[PDB]
Amino acid sequence: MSYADSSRNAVLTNGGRTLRAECRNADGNWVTSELDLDTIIGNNDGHFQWGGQNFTETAEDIRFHPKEGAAEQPILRARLRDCNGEFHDRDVNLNRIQNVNGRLVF
Q1: Is 8 helix (H, G, I), strand (E, B) or coil?
Q2: Which of 37, 46, 55, 104 is within CB 3.0–4.6 Å of 33 for a Cys-Cys bond?
Q3: DSSP assignment string, 27-78
């Protein structure tokens, strides 16, 4: 139930914070939806954590590929600072985010 299965034109915007896509609704029309990832993803000791917040505050080199790799997955990458102050390049698959009738929802 990844949003990506029923959405298109997904991009990361707003300083690395916001996922934007066009999301198909029950009628088969396409609705523009944004979701601020900083409301739902944190940085826990240098790792992405769903249900956390404000990952961007302790991140560098934030970027997104909507259809990455052989699996064509929506992969968000960043260098995250751990609690010892060291950066590690990390990745998280955004397929936890759903498309609920035209809206991106965690």
Answers
A1: strand
A2: 104
A3: TS-EEEEEEEGGGTEEEETTEEEET--BGGGGEEEEEEEEEETTTTEEEEEE
Residue type, 57: E
Q: Which residues pair with 64 in a beta bridge?
A: 76
Separation between Cα atoms, residue 97 and residue 57, nearest integer Å: 21
Structure tokens at 13: 């915007």
Technique used by the depositors: X-ray
CATH among 2.70.70.10, 3.40.190.10, 1.10.8.60, 2.30.60.10 for 1-106: 2.30.60.10
Annotated resolution, angstroms: 1.6
Which residue from 96, 103, 56 is spatially nearest to 77, judged by alpha carbons? 56
Pick from 105, 12, 99: nearest CA to 62: 12
